[PDB]
Design a binder for this molecule. Structure first.
Ligand SMILES: [Cu+2]
Lengths: 162, 162, 162
């Protein structure tokens, strides 16, 4: 198990352009294409990223192309963030994946807003962080895409994934 | 062994644009580019599929790009075909590959024309189907690309491939 | 171990356009883009090779795209060269990688200029070749990118790589 399979399971794979939980055009493994209402704009953006006329359809491999890039961006955002780097430094390989998972889903700024939880994670207070993270809007709007992630912060194992 | 390696062996790999058994421009693993006599048209079509100026030459990976797509198309054609779906449902994992193999080579309509053989396969009559499939024009025009496939319908093993 | 990992170690991976040991724009695993002083020209050349607007940045996979092509070109250059083919024929699997390595780095013409060493390699004179190859400008300008390669010609093992 690793961050890729972890997100593969949490996000899932969709090989054709679709609207997300906010009506935003998305594809592959949770990759946002545009906030524009235009499907042609979504197709235009996908074509530039992939490098060919896709007409809104891609392969499992091209989904991994956008996937590796997105994961790297999430990790990069964590390393150059003052509020996230100390937390990332302190964590173990497994809980580090859970952090990247949240940033992948919400972005670095959004995750850096969990003042309490980030403090509790830094201080190995696993249960307090889990309880606090359940209270979030993040959990309310997406309880399924989040349930496993919080359990991972609690246990430090991959048991919620297999 | 699987459908990919099965077709990899039956079709073979060609990394530059070539004419097939009917004079049609083809590339990679039996991928038809165009029925047009124009090589520039074949190059034009390849460029659109791959996503770059190839000038008639591709890599082993880009051949797999067209390969996965073609295999998926063959499977899709079988699942949404009334004459093929019952046959596919009834067959075992190995003989299911042989069916996809024929559709890959001939298309769903062409394979659905083997009324007798499809009936015999549905009724586990392995030898009767093999005998009938040897009588076909499919076997006459391409005895080599077909010999293994028929043997697989007969035995239900991968022995003709290794 | 193989030629790919051998070059992966000797060349290294760089995912953004950079200047080489002569000021030439390069990317991935030692792939030369252009001798032009223009970065836009380097970007223009990269875009044509990869097949998308990269703006000077590529993925590990796209670096492997250029990598496989470059390795194949080096091997092809050896097989169709009168001065290199006899040497390649005579060598063992491991020392054959070392030859491809030099051609990858210098080109077929540049490697075919080592009259003495090529003769000594053809005659299994391992130590004489190593001594001669250390005297070269190739070793002086790039002692690190060369040290392992010469040691491989000497020993016939992968010990300098791991
Ligand atoms: Cu690829």
């Amino acid at each position: 198990m690793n961050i890729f399979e972890m997100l593969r399971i949490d996000e899932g794979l969709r090989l054709k352009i679709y609207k997300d939980t906010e009506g935003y055009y998305t594809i592959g493994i949770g990759h946002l294409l545009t906030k524009s209402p235009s499907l042609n704009a979504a197709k235009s953006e996908l074509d530039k990223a992939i490098g060919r006329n896709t007409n809104g359809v891609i392969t499992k491999h091209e989904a991994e192309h956008l996937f590796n890039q997105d994961v790297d961006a999430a990790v990069h955002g964590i390393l150059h963030n003052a509020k996230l780097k100390p937390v990332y430094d302190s964590l173990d390989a497994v809980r580090r994946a859970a952090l990247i998972n949240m940033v992948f889903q919400m972005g670095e700024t959004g995750v850096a807003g969990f003042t309490n939880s980030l403090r509790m994670l830094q201080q190995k207070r696993w249960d307090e962080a889990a309880v606090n993270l359940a209270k979030s809007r993040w959990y309310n709007q997406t309880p399924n895409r989040a349930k496993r992630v919080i359990t991972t912060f609690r246990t430090g194992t991959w048991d919620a994934y297999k």
